[PDB]
Automatic annotation (TrEMBL):
It comes from the Eukaryota. Belongs to the glycosyl hydrolase 62 family. Its EC number is 3.2.1.55. The keyword Calcium applies. This is Alpha-L-arabinofuranosidase. The chain holds residues 82 to 397 of 397 of the full protein. It is found in: Secreted. Its main location: secreted.
């Protein structure tokens, strides 16, 4: 894995349908390739609220024409749900879909190909943990992420107030028994460590990669990166500055025209789909949300669309 990054971005690939729901943004994607298809889960976003959509397609060229399955038709149901993460929890032979609903929540499903199968929400905690209540400021408890190793499962989350939290439980007890979170990382400037963590095992190494979204000096979204030999840290900077970013307008080329100056809430294409959240160190690809740089107004009505970064300084195939 290199210590600097360069990317080539697609145009916008996935946006809202023109249906009566009048969704304004498609957001916060999670993605796996399974049995010959891409499976994308995303937030639907508008002034009126958030829920979740499932999108599947064979080929990236067909992403834009793929049908949506609105997950409020499954037991997962209506109400607020946002920012999904999908993975296969192999010990239970069950797919998990992790998201936020005011708490840290999850659904299960034996078959990712069955969007109607996602369960009504359960929560990982009985309420907001004390350490998060104490330090949230006037932020929001968001962006829930699970990663496991051979003995522990870890649940990360953000507060939009410069704290990354981490709880753990045993692999056998998952999804139950998550302990009181510790602050895994923090910054006194909430903009430097804002939300939307990703945490991955780097194949071929005994290291992990942390990505985290930030709001830069220009007001634009970007990603910082760190690595560690443990999911529990300590984290050391990889590409974590505006002049050496994980992903930002200044290291993102476009084959076409530059349609976004924001590189926001995304996910890397994985090398496998299980609860260890593995990535290859080669040919990194980042599925992310961007938007017209002239967009303004209420945050929830912003016209987010999904695009794909392909690494151009790749170390390997
Ligand atoms: Ca996410």
């Amino acid at each position: 894995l290199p210590s600097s990054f360069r990317w080539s971005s697609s145009g916008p690939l996935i946006g809202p349908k023109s249906d009566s729901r009048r969704i304004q943004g498609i957001k916060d994607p999670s993605v796996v390739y399974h049995d010959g298809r891409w499976h994308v889960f995303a937030s639907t976003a508008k002034t009126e609220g958030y829920n979740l959509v499932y999108i599947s397609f064979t080929d990236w060229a067909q992403a834009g024409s793929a049908s949506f399955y609105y997950l409020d038709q499954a037991p997962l149901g209506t109400g607020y749900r946002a920012a999904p993460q999908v993975f296969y929890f192999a010990p239970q032979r069950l797919w998990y879909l992790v998201y936020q609903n005011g708490n840290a929540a999850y659904s299960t499903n034996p078959d990712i190909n069955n969007p109607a199968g996602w369960t009504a929400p359960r929560t990982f905690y009985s309420g907001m943990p004390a350490i998060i209540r104490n330090n949230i400021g006037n932020g929001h408890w968001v962006d829930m992420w699970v990663i496991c190793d051979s003995s522990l499962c870890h649940l990360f989350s953000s507060d939009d107030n410069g704290h990354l939290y981490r709880s753990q439980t045993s692999l056998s007890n998952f999804p139950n028994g998550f302990n009181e979170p510790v602050i895994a990382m923090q910054d006194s400037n909430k903009n430097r460590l804002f939300e939307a963590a990703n945490v991955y095992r780097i194949d071929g190494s005994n290291e992990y990669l942390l990505l985290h979204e930030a709001i830069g000096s220009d007001g634009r979204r970007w990603f910082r990166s760190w690595t560690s030999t443990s999911i529990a840290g300590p984290w050391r900077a990889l590409a974590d500055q505006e002049s050496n970013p994980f992903a930002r307008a200044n290291n993102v080329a476009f084959t076409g025209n530059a349609w976004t100056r924001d590189i926001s809430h995304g996910e890397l294409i994985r090398s496998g789909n299980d609860q260890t959240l593995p990535i290859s160190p080669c040919n990194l690809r980042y599925l992310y949300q961007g938007l017209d740089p002239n967009s303004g107004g209420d945050y929830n009505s912003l016209p987010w669309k999904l695009g794909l970064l392909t690494q151009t300084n790749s170390a390997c195939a």
